[PDB]
Amino acid sequence: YVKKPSYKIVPHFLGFNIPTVSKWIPIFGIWGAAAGIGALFLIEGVPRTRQDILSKIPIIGEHWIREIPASDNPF
Template sequence: MVFQSPILRQSYKSPYGPKYHLQPNVAGWTFKQLGSLGFKAGAFGGVALFAVIFYASGIPRVKRDILQKVPFIGGHFIKETPASDNPF
């Protein structure tokens, strides 16, 4: 069996053949896939954070320490009912 030398093998490349190129990756994930995965994970994390804050908005400590300090909607969580009218 006759083997070609590396010099002759790389001297001609057919224009009709496949165009191979190195695709950089991290543990088998390409950077395009990692970007898409990161965007989706961020979106799900944002929705999960909103759900947790929505469900915990009835807790007085959460209202006082977190929700009242949010710039445009913080005034909605300030309770101005006098203590004598509050059953809780």
């Protein structure tokens, strides 16, 4: 015979609890990647982005190593 139902209250805040949030942790990850890729793509033209990030990527990085010949540069 059962006298009482068996349960606990899980900690919660602003209507979030850890079981639920834990399911969304990976989604925040992917959105973070999406925002990272997007941001980097937006500033791909900035010379510092190329110098410090993009030209350092292996294989692919040579796409961003481009020199103007000294004969063709007024400045």
